Design a protein around this ligand. Structure first.
Ligand SMILES: [Zn+2]
Ligand SMILES: [Zn+2]
Ligand SMILES: [Zn+2]
Length: 178
């Protein structure tokens, strides 16, 4: 197994996947690494099994159909994995915890949102459809763009949104377009 956490790239108290070489901190894995379960398979492994059991699940889809899906177990898992793919980028630090807003010439967003809030909301089964999760995720970056205005710090929102959107298109097999 690897000697660093796949998500945050630091060593520490790591849990090792039995079916691949990845390792994780307890709360870096999503869902949090399960108490028992020997062998244990990580989220990467679980996502790979879905594709292998239904090869046609990789044929292109329309975003509008994906968003209306109900959060059954497989969609729950895919959203967890997409969330984890964001936390894998070190720039997710800026969006992880609850923000506050006090900048001359700007007003805070009407609906603040952050990664740890989305994490909790997944954990507590608060999304009934994929659309709920994706709207909250895109809201994080949209709030950041609006607040920061012409400050060059706005670019951090563009960068992490790009990671989100590439991974969304990959995980949910969105039809490729020009
Ligand atoms: Zn970690
Ligand atoms: Zn694994
Ligand atoms: Zn099949």
């Amino acid at each position: 197994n690897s000697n660093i956490c796949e998500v945050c790239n630091k060593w520490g108290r790591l849990f090792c996947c039995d079916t691949c070489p990845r390792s994780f901190h307890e709360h870096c894995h999503i869902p949090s690494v399960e108490a028992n379960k020997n062998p244990w398979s990580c989220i990467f492994c679980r996502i790979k099994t879905i594709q292998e059991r239904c090869p046609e699940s990789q044929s292109g889809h329309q975003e509008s159909e994906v968003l209306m899906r109900q959060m059954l177990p497989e969609e729950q898992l895919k959203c967890e994995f997409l969330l984890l793919k964001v936390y894998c980028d070190s720039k997710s630090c800026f969006f992880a915890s609850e923000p506050y807003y006090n900048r001359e010439g700007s007003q805070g967003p009407q609906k603040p949102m952050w990664l740890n809030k989305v994490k909790t909301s997944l954990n507590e089964q608060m999304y009934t459809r994929v659309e709920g999760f994706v709207q909250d995720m895109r809201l994080i970056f949209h709030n950041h763009k609006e607040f920061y205005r012409e400050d060059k710090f706005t670019r951090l929102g563009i960068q992490v949104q790009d990671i989100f959107e590439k991974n969304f298109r990959n995980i949910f097999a969105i039809q490729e377009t020009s």
